Every structure is written in structure tokens, then in C-alpha cells.
Design an enzyme around this catalytic site. Structure first.
Site, PDB file in Angstrom:
ATOM      1  N   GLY A 198     -38.188 -58.422  12.302  1.00  0.00           N
ATOM      2  CA  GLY A 198     -39.257 -58.493  11.293  1.00  0.00           C
ATOM      3  C   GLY A 198     -39.291 -59.078   9.965  1.00  0.00           C
ATOM      4  N   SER A 199     -39.390 -58.551   9.309  1.00  0.00           N
ATOM      5  CA  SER A 199     -39.595 -58.989   7.679  1.00  0.00           C
ATOM      6  C   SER A 199     -38.225 -59.342   7.057  1.00  0.00           C
ATOM      7  CB  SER A 199     -40.319 -58.141   6.854  1.00  0.00           C
ATOM      8  OG  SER A 199     -40.165 -58.521   5.470  1.00  0.00           O
TER       9      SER A 199
END
Lengths: 87, 530, 99, 370, 93
Positions: free
Chosen positions: B275-276
Site C-alpha cells: 500500500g502506502s
């Protein structure tokens, strides 16, 4: 003359080969002597370390010096007054 | 034979001698063309941490030795021995009968010496006893997954004890004994090959760091009510693993009826979308090749982009325009997607591959899985939107930690290693030093700034890192490195869905990051930088 | 008799503690403290007491480099204000405790 | 005491240099060296148990080997006419030594027999001196037969005036192997000595009957589950293979053969040097025996009949001893108590074997030059 | 009738045979010595394994008496220990 010279030379070479190199040679005798010396040194070190650990356990059963040393070393704690110096 | 007065008699005598010699030769070569070898078990090697604390010792246990041929001569003693051995008489009898032809079978394995000798002394129907070695793990539950267990045969079955099974399980020896038809050893005479004892193995785990990480992860799981968790601490310079914990951890010596999740190493089999947390690598690649200034402004408005059937949405869309630092601070996704659009995704894949994302780990653990990093000759908009974003890229906790350590090492990707590394490996310079320094300072700023990540600040150390969340159900991820001017430890924190807490990384994983890394740096004697 | 530093330790480690005392005196003479007593529990901990009343505690193992770290810390940071110091602990991987 | 020796001329101190029979000497020296090596290898463990010195039996066998070579030189000095004229005294001294052995006051006791004399450091076994003296006396009787009354009935029993009492007294203490070897030598000597076939058959049948009669009521000492050894010795031949496991690397000698250096030397030899080594040793023994028989053939050609019959007797002593010992180690025969001529450790056996080799070389030299 | 003669290399052959005998005796004694040394090394390794078994037993006995939780609890509750703050600790170099 005779082929006995050839037979004796071949047998002598083979037996000297088996005597100086290979399994059951003098080289293996020297090895095993070195291994004996190394293992004896290791045994003395181990039998001293076991005694030290046994005494540490015995003091653990009644004392606090080992607890203090482990707290100072691993946990990094410090008694009253502190003033911890680090580098 | 012609010279003899009686050549016939001499010929007969020589023929008789040759006939006897021929009979002897026939019986020697035409007819001819006890003592048994018993192995000498080898002492298993000791596993210890990087300082000297033992993590797996070979304590001795007394194992009862059974010779069925002797029990068939004292069958009348079977109930008496079965009463002390704690088994039904019928079970003992049928087991012996099934093992009738065998020479050596086991009765029990882990009986203590002070009572096994009593059992073999009270009843003597030809039963013996041996003091064999069994694995004990003094650290126990903390290092249960890094230092895996061994079976009853004392060989590796999981973890580092099977990864390093050859190194630890020394070569057993052989010796010759006088074993009769019944099987009793009359005498010991010669050892044809001495047993080679196992070599002591030193791990990279810092048992103080491991204890601290395990305690902090346990507190995180208990107060946050999460299903599972993971936490890997690494030394950036040497590239080794300083700690590894998975709170569902089991007890490696008391293995009575353990669930698998309890024995699963959630740091190398449990894969997830970064993800991030993978955005810093993508934007670093953008900086390296796309000439993207860190202070450049990207039009993130309105915070929602439509690409065919795929849509990218940001957590916050109030900010009309954000810079790269603003993109990471706000965890913006449209901005980084547009940046990846403006650059080549092949460079993105190369930079993610060279840092070890989903390719392989040098650990070689038995219970290990590798992530998936998609590769394509051409990169469509959807593919790069799912690739540069961690929304289709799968990595493990150890891979993410290794990548973040490489990023913290000024782009020097040091190979992974569980064994204590004594000299710093050269590795490979995946990221140019100036780009790596810029990204390190930016990850310092994001946790320093007033954005979504403020709880990750280590008290006394100006830490750095990024928070991200997976969706396959949320998984909280946070990886970072605490020392700013000279990073020394980089680590990742992974925890599953919290039942009574928010799934945001900056709320549920940042405090854990700060708590464990404060002590981790304190015991590593790194000077403060805040 | 009382002027000489009294030696304490295990019965069979009495020879070892003597060599340890020689090494510690050799490495401690430039620092100014005079050894008054040295005790060893069989555990391996090393206790040092000086004539001025300040005491040094050293744990088992790594004594040879722990003492050098003590020398460095004292001679470049702790060389001043020794009067209040009455208890010194070295039982740290690298640190030092002053009391 | 050295007046009986004739150093000039002799096979070593001849004017032409040294002129002995090289084939027989080479065969016997190969056998002697192989025996020393096998004794060392097989007796390492056996001597380690008794004395702290592993080289106890090996050093003793080397000393006996040097003494045997010296004895061979001394015998090769000795002319055969002295043996011919001394045969009766040799027979008498063999009788005396054997009787003294029978006496418990000086003879030392063994597990199942008393066939040695202490003599302090070095042991003496007159059961082999008796065999050699019987050979010499039998050769003398054979040559006297051709000169005395033809087929005299008083001379028919003359061998049994000596052969039968010696066989009985050698059976007195359990030494059935040595008695059988001596009787085989005597009977084969006579067969080759010209005794008529019917007469020889009568002699051999009456001798066998007398021996089977005398085998009774002969315990070890009077006035003035053992199959495991053979079973595990038969395993040695099979496990040695076509190529042996090498010197010292034997295994059965360490557990099942406490007599690996005395009796079962052939099993140890065939396990260490393999079936090819056992066949080479068998060929060496056969060659040496046939050479000691052809030496007698040659001495018979030169009309020196006493030398011919002495060589036949020595060759048949060697044939009987080695054949019985090998056929027992290989399992054909049950007569346990025998040792190989050269390879076995036996002290006085080696000295007597070297003396027999010297006698055969003297026969070979004398059949050529006077 | 005639005379015999030893082969020309009689002394060389005798020396070769003496060397062969010495080599074979040395091989036998070397094999025996190697087996004795193997037995001695087995005894030494048995002593080492006994010492390591005792050390493992002592470590198992110490494990209940030494753990991070127990040591920390004893240091805090009994020894009144405290973890120094990053500002409190005076660091050198």
C-alpha cells in the site's frame, strides 16, 4: 635380475603409500593427536564454564547479584543516582 | 621326475599333494567368495544470539531402551513394567508382538534421568535406558518462529533449525561392538569413525531487542484487539535481522496440541499489499529518472481519477494541490499515480526488484513464501496504477523491512542474513546516494510534520517512516528508520485488523513503532538527534 | 599486612585472581587509584575497591575491554569530580554507571 | 663345539663366493618376512592385553627370526655326513627332551596341553626337534635297509621301535597335529624310499591301528562351545574379498581369535590380504615344498641317498604342517592344535624351520660339489 | 658337477626386502596406533558430550530463574532499578 625387483619395488611403493598417506597412515596419527589436543583444551574450557554456570545458578537460588548484573547488562537499567555514561 | 629311482611314486605323491592343495583352493575361493556397526550420535550445535545468549541448547533426557527379544523371555514381567510405564498391558503386549522381529524399539522419549533410572532399576526384564539429547529453547516463545523446533528424531523441521540443519546436526560416527544373536552388547572394541559434534551457530537476533519487540507487539495485540501481528527489526549497515516477532507465536518446547496459526511465521509466509508504504520507492524512482523535483506541485484535485473500470480515491481530498512531501504527508494516491504516469513504469519495476520486493530473500527459511511483483513488456495505465501503488503488488514483512533498510543505507542494498554478520557486505547501490538522502529526509519530515503521522515520533530520536494500509480485512503497516543523520536500525510493523481500534497505520502502528524503537535505539547506544 | 591489597576469590581461582589483579593494576596505575581490595565471586564477577573509597564493579567476561572503556570514560569525561563518586558499575555492554 | 662345522668350503664361504639355491632361499625368506608381518598385525591386540607393550609378540618373533637366520647359517656350515653319523644321538636327545617335557616339574602348563619348556625368557617346543630327528633317523634307516639283510622281518618293525613310542608320547600330552605330521613325513618318506607297496601298506595300516589304540588314556599330565572361533574365522576369508582390507585393518582378530597370531594366522592373512593373498601364500608354500622335494630328487640323482631322504622328510614335514593348518583354518579338518611353519608366531618352530631350510640348502649344495 | 651363483643385485634385493619388511611393520603399527587414537578421541568426545549435557541441564535449570519478565520485575520491584531517559544519560564521544 629377476622380476623380484619389480615385485619388491611395487610392494614397497604401495606400502609406503599406505603408511604415509590415506586411512591408517602416520598423517592420520598426527591428525588424531592434534584432534586429541584440541578436544582436551575444549574439555577444560567447557568444564570451567559449567562450574561457573553452576555457581551462577546456585547464587540465583538465594542472591541478587546476578539479577543486578543481568539488569544492568541486558535491560540497561541503573540504580538510584543514575548518571549513566555511554559511548 | 625322471631322476628318481621310483618316478611313479614321486608322481603319485606330487599328484596327491596337488589334489589336496586344489581342494584347499576350492574351499578358499570357490566357497568363501557377530560384529555389527552402531552409530555414535552427534551433539547438535548450539544456537545463540549475536551477543552470546543461548537460543537453543541440547539438554539431555533419559530415554528407555527396549530390546524385544529380551521381553519375549520375560513376558510374565510385562504387566509390572507397563504399570510403571503408564500404558495398558494389552497395548504393551501388542506393541511388542508387532515389534517381535525388531532388535531395538523405543518405550518413552523424554523421561527425566532421576525417574527413568528408577523405572529401569525396579523392573529389569532386559530393558535398558539411554541419556539422549533433546532440544530446549531458553528464550522460548519470543524466538519461537526464528528458531524453529526439532522433531523427536532431533533434526530440523521448521525455522532456522531446518534452514541450518546441516550446519547444526553434526556428522554422526560409527563403532563396532560384540552383539550376539539376542542383541546384547558384550563389549565395545573399536570406533571406526568418531562422531563430529555440531558447530555452534550465532544468530543476528539481539535477544534484548527481541524481548522488547515481543513485549511491545504483545501489548499492541492485547490493547488493540488485533488478530495477529509482525515486527522485524534490522541493522541497515550489516543487512542482518536484529529481531522478528509474530504475536500469535507458540511455545517451541511445549508443543502439545498447537494450532497452525500459532506456529505460522507471519513475517515470511504472510504476504500482503504494502500500500502506502511502497510509495517512497516509487517516488524515489521518479526522482532518479523522471527529474521530478521534490518541491514540485502536483494537481491532486479533486482527489479522484477514473481510468476505465479502475478508480483511485484518496483518504483526504480537501487539499487542492499538494507537493511530493504533501503527497506523502496526506498519503495521497492520485498524485503518485499521476507521477508514475509521467515516468516509465519499467524503471519503477526495476527499482522495486533490485531492493528485493517479491523476488527472493537470502534467508532460505523452510516456512517461507515470496511475494508477487508483476512484470510486463508494456505498462498500461491500470497496470502502473496497480503496480506503483501497492494495490496488486504483494510483499512479505521481511521483504518490506529489507527494502526499507536498503533505502535507509543510502541506497546500499545489503543482502539479507540471519547469521551474525561480522563484516559489512558491499551489496549493491540500487538508489543513488543523493536521491536516497532526499527520500530519507522526506520520510523524516512526514513523521515530523503535523500531518497524519505524528505518533511515530520516537522520544529522544527524530525517527522516520511511512504508514500504509492493505485491504486483503485491513492490515496496518508501518516501516521506517529512526536515526536521521546516520540511520542504524530500520524496521517494519505489521498487525492485522484491530477489533477495538482504527485501522489507520498512524493511529494503531505508529505508537508501537515509537515504543519499541525507543528502547531498540537505547540498547544500541545510538546518540539522540532530536 | 593490612597495607597490602587483600585478595579474595574462589579457592581454586586464587591463582587467576592474582593475574587479574596484576593486569588491573597495570591498566589502572595512570588513572591514580590505588587498589586496596579485589574480590571474585565464583560466578566470575570482579569487585574492585580503591584506597580512596570508590569501588568498581565488573561482571564476568569482557573484563579486558570493559576496563579499557572505563579508562577512556574516566580520563576524558569523568576525570573531574571524583569525591562524590563512591560506586562505579561497568556491567554494561559499553556504558558506565557512576554513583 | 665348532669342530663339527665346516666354514670352508660352504654355501656362503665358498671360493666361488656364495652359491646356495636362490629359489628356495627366496621362497623361504618371503615366507619368513610375511610371517613376521602377519605376526605383528595379528598379535598387536593380543599382546596389548597381556603386557602394556603392543610389540611384545612382534619383537619376540623378530628375535626368533634373527636367531633362526643364525641357525640356518650354522646348519648350512654343518656337513651332511655329521647328520648321518649323529642321527642316533639326535634321536636320543629328542627322546630325552620329550620325556622331560612330559615331567610336570619343568614343563609349563597350557589350556589343553603341556608341550613346552620354560627356559626363562625363551620357550622350547621339542615336538619339532622330535620331528626333525625322526626325519634324520628315518633317512638313516632307509639307507641302512639297502645295505643290511633284504626284507628282514626284524628290520620291518625297526621304524616302530622309534616311530611308535614317539607317536605315543607325543600323543601323551595332547599334540595330535604334530604326531600326524611326523607320521605323514615318515610314511611318505618310506613310500618314496623304495618300500614295497604291500609292505608299505602293511606298515601304514599297523601304524594307524597303533595310533588309534594309543590315543586312549593319555591325559595332559602324568609321571616321568569352542566352535565359535572356527565359525568366525571362516567369516574372515569371505569378508576379505578378492583384494584384502590391508595390513592391521583386520577385524576378527580383535574379537574372536585370541590365537590369531599362533594358530589362525592364515585366517588373518586371508582377511587382510584377501583371497589373492591367501592364494599367493598357498602357492608360495607349495613351491617351497616342491622345491624341497626336487632337492631330494637331485640328491638322489647324484647317488647321495641320505641327503635325498632327509630332503624328502623335511619337505613332507612342511607339507603336512602347512596342509593341516590351512585345511583347519579353512575348516576342512578339525585338528585345532597346529601352527603354520613360517607365518605362525611359534618361537622354536621358526628356529627349527630355518634350520630345516639350511639343511635343504646344504643338500642342494652337496649334490653339486661333493 | 657345477656351481650356482646368486643374482647380481643380491644386496640390492636384500635391502629392498628389508625396506619392504620395515614398511609393512610400520603399516601394521600405524594402523594399530590409529585405532588406539580413535578410541582415545572417542573417550575425549564422550567427556565433551557429558560436559555439554551437564551444561544443558544447568541452562534448563537457570531458565526458570532467569527471564526478561522475571529479571525486569525483580529489578523494578526489588532492586528499585530505573531505565534512564535519553536526556538523563550523559553520553561520551
Amino acid at each position: 635380475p629377476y622380476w623380484l625387483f619389480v615385485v619388491l619395488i611395487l610392494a614397497l611403493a604401495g606400502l609406503q603409500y599406505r603408511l604415509w598417506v590415506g586411512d591408517g597412515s602416520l598423517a592420520q596419527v598426527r591428525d588424531l593427536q592434534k584432534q586429541i589436543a584440541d578436544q582436551h583444551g575444549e574439555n577444560e574450557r567447557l568444564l570451567e564454564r559449567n562450574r561457573i554456570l553452576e555457581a551462577e545458578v546456585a547464587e540465583l537460588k538465594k542472591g541478587t547479584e546476578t539479577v543486578e548484573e543481568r539488569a544492568r547488562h541486558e535491560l540497561g537499567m541503573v540504580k538510584d543516582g543514575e548518571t549513566l555514561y555511554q559511548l | 621326475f625322471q631322476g628318481a629311482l621310483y618316478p611313479w611314486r614321486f608322481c603319485v605323491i606330487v599328484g596327491l599333494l596337488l589334489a589336496m592343495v586344489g581342494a584347499i583352493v576350492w574351499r578358499i575361493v570357490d566357497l568363501h567368495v557377530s560384529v555389527r556397526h552402531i552409530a555414535i550420535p552427534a551433539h547438535r550445535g548450539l544456537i545463540t544470539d549475536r551477543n552470546g545468549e543461548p537460543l537453543a541448547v541440547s539438554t539431555p533426557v533419559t530415554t528407555l531402551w527396549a530390546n524385544p527379544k529380551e521381553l519375549m523371555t520375560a513376558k510374565e514381567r510385562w504387566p509390572q513394567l507397563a504399570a510403571a510405564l503408564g500404558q495398558d498391558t494389552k497395548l504393551f503386549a501388542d506393541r511388542i508382538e508387532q515389534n517381535a522381529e525388531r532388535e531395538f524399539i523405543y518405550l518413552v522419549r523424554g523421561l527425566t534421568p532421576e525417574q527413568g533410572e528408577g523405572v529401569i532399576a525396579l523392573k529389569v526384564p532386559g530393558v535398558y535406558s539411554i541419556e539422549e539429547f533433546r532440544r530446549f529453547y531458553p528464550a522460548g516463545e519470543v524466538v519461537a518462529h526464528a528458531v524453529g523446533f526439532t522433531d523427536v528424531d532431533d533434526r530440523g523441521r521448521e525455522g532456522i533449525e531446518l534452514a541450518f540443519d546441516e550446519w547444526l546436526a553434526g556428522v554422526p560416527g560409527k563403532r563396532q561392538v560384540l552383539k550376539d544373536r539376542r542383541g546384547r552388547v558384550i563389549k565395545d572394541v573399536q570406533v571406526t569413525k568418531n562422531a563430529k559434534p555440531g558447530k555452534t551457530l550465532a544468530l543476528s537476533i539481539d535477544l534484548r531487542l527481541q524481548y522488547l519487540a515481543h513485549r511491545e507487539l504483545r501489548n499492541a495485540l492485547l490493547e488493540n484487539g488485533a488478530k495477529a501481528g509482525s515486527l522485524v527489526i534490522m541493522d541497515v549497515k550489516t543487512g542482518e535481522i536484529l529481531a522478528m516477532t509474530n504475536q500469535p507465536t507458540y511455545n517451541p518446547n511445549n508443543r502439545r496440541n498447537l494450532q497452525p496459526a500459532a506456529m505460522r511465521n507471519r513475517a515470511m509466509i504472510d504476504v500482503f499489499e504494502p500500500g502506502s508504504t511502497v510509495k517512497p520507492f516509487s517516488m524515489s524512482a521518479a526522482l532518479a529518472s523522471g527529474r521530478w523535483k521534490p518541491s514540485d506541485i502536483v494537481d491532486v484535485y479533486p482527489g479522484t481519477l477514473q481510468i476505465g473500470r479502475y478508480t483511485i480515491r484518496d483518504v483526504s481530498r480537501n487539499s487542492r494541490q499538494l507537493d511530493l512531501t504533501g503527497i506523502l504527508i496526506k498519503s495521497s494516491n492520485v498524485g503518485i499515480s499521476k507521477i508514475a504516469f509521467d515516468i516509465g513504469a519499467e524503471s519503477i519495476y526495476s527499482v522495486m526488484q533490485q531492493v528485493g520486493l517479491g523476488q527472493d530473500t537470502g534467508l532460505g527459511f523452510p516456512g517461507e513464501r515470496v511475494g508477487n511483483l508483476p512484470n510486463h513488456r508494456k505498462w498500461p495505465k491500470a497496470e502502473t496504477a496497480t503496480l506503483a501503488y501497492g494495490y496488486g503488488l504483494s510483499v512479505t514483512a521481511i521483504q518490506l523491512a529489507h527494502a526499507y533498510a536498503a533505502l535507509a543505507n543510502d541506497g546500499k542494498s545489503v543482502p539479507l542474513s540471519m547469521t551474525r554478520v561480522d563484516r559489512v557486505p558491499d551489496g549493491v547501490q540500487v538508489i543513488s546516494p543523493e536521491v536516497a538522502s532526499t527520500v530519507q529526509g522526506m520520510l523524516q519530515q512526514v513523521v515530523e510534520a503535523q500531518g497524519g503521522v505524528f505518533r511515530a515520533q520516537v522520544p529522544g530520536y527524530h525517527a522516520a517512516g511511512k504508514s500504509g494500509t492493505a485491504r486483503k480485512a485491513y492490515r496496518s503497516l508501518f516501516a521506517g528508520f529512526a536515526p536521521a543523520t546516520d540511520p542504524r536500525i530500520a524496521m517494519v510493523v505489521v498487525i492485522d485488523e484491530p477489533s477495538k481500534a482504527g485501522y489507520f497505520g498512524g493511529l494503531v502502528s505508529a505508537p508501537v513503532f515509537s515504543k519499541v524503537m525507543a528502547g531498540a535505539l537505547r540498547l544500541m547506544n545510538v546518540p539522540p538527534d532530536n | 599486612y593490612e597495607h597490602l591489597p587483600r585478595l579474595h576469590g574462589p579457592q581454586r581461582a586464587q591463582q587467576q585472581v592474582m593475574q587479574q589483579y596484576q593486569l588491573l593494576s597495570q591498566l589502572l596505575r595512570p588513572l591514580g587509584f590505588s587498589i586496596a581490595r579485589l574480590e571474585m565471586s565464583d560466578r566470575g564477577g570482579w569487585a574492585l575497591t580503591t584506597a580512596q573509597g570508590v569501588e568498581i564493579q565488573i561482571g564476568r567476561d569482557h573484563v579486558v575491554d570493559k576496563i579499557r572503556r572505563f579508562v577512556s570514560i574516566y580520563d576524558k569525561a569523568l576525570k573531574d569530580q571524583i569525591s562524590n563518586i563512591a560506586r562505579i558499575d561497568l556491567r554494561y555492554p559499553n556504558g558506565l554507571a557512576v554513583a | 663345539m665348532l669342530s663339527v662345522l665346516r666354514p670352508f668350503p660352504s654355501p656362503l664361504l665358498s671360493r666361488h663366493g656364495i652359491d646356495l639355491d636362490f629359489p628356495l632361499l627366496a621362497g623361504c625368506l618371503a615366507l619368513l618376512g610375511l610371517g613376521l608381518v602377519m605376526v605383528t598385525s595379528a598379535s598387536s591386540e593380543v599382546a596389548a592385553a597381556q603386557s602394556g607393550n603392543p610389540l611384545y609378540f612382534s619383537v619376540r618373533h623378530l628375535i626368533y627370526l634373527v636367531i633362526g637366520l643364525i641357525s640356518c647359517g650354522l646348519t648350512m656350515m654343518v656337513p651332511m655326513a655329521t647328520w648321518q653319523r649323529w642321527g642316533w644321538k639326535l634321536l636320543l636327545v629328542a627322546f630325552g627332551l620329550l620325556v622331560l617335557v612330559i615331567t610336570p616339574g619343568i614343563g609349563r602348563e597350557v589350556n589343553g596341553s603341556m608341550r613346552w619348556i620354560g627356559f626363562g625368557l625363551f620357550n622350547i617346543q621339542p615336538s619339532e626337534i622330535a620331528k626333525v630327528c625322526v626325519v634324520i633317523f628315518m633317512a638313516g634307516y632307509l639307507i641302512r635297509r639297502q645295505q643290511e639283510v633284504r626284507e628282514s622281518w626284524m628290520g620291518f618293525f625297526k621304524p616302530f621301535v622309534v616311530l611308535l613310542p614317539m607317536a605315543g608320547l607325543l600323543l601323551r600330552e595332547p599334540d595330535f597335529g604334530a604326531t600326524v605330521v611326523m607320521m605323514g613325513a615318515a610314511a611318505a618318506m618310506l613310500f618314496l624310499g623304495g618300500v614295497g607297496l604291500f609292505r608299505f601298506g602293511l606298515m601304514v595300516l599297523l601304524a594307524v591301528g597303533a595310533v588309534v589304540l594309543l590315543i586312549q588314556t593319555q591325559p595332559y599330565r602324568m609321571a616321568r562351545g569352542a566352535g565359535y572361533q572356527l565359525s568366525q574365522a571362516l567369516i574372515a576369508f569371505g569378508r576379505g574379498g578378492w583384494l584384502g582390507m590391508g595390513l592391521g585393518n583386520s577385524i576378527q582378530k580383535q574379537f574372536y581369535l585370541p590365537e590369531a597370531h599362533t594358530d589362525f594366522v592364515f585366517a588373518v592373512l586371508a582377511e587382510e590380504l584377501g583371497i589373492v593373498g591367501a592364494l599367493a601364500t598357498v602357492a608360495l608354500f607349495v613351491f617351497v615344498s616342491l622345491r624341497a622335494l626336487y632337492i631330494g630328487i637331485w640328491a638322489e640323482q647324484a647317488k647321495q641317498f641320505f641327503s635325498a631322504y632327509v630332503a624328502y622328510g623335511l619337505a613332507f614335514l612342511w607339507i603336512g604342517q602347512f596342509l593341516i593348518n590351512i585345511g583347519v583354518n579353512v575348516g576342512l579338518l578339525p585338528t585345532k592344535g597346529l601352527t603354520l611353519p613360517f607365518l605362525s608366531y611359534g618361537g622354536s618352530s621358526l628356529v627349527i624351520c630355518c634350520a630345516c631350510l639350511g639343511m635343504l640348502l646344504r643338500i642342494e649344495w652337496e649334490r653339486r660339489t661333493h | 658337477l657345477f656351481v650356482k651363483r646368486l643374482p647380481t643385485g643380491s644386496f640390492l634385493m636384500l635391502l629392498l626386502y628389508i625396506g619392504l619388511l620395515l614398511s609393512a611393520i610400520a603399516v601394521a603399527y600405524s594402523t594399530y596406533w590409529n585405532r588406539q587414537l580413535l578410541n582415545s578421541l572417542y573417550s575425549e568426545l564422550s567427556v565433551r558430550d557429558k560436559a555439554q549435557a551437564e551444561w544443558g541441564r544447568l541452562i534448563l535449570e537457570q531458565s526458570t530463574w532467569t527471564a526478561h519478565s522475571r529479571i525486569e520485575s525483580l529489578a523494578v520491584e526489588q532492586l528499585r532499578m530505573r531505565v534512564p531517559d535519553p536526556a538523563e544519560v550523559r553520553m561520551v564521544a
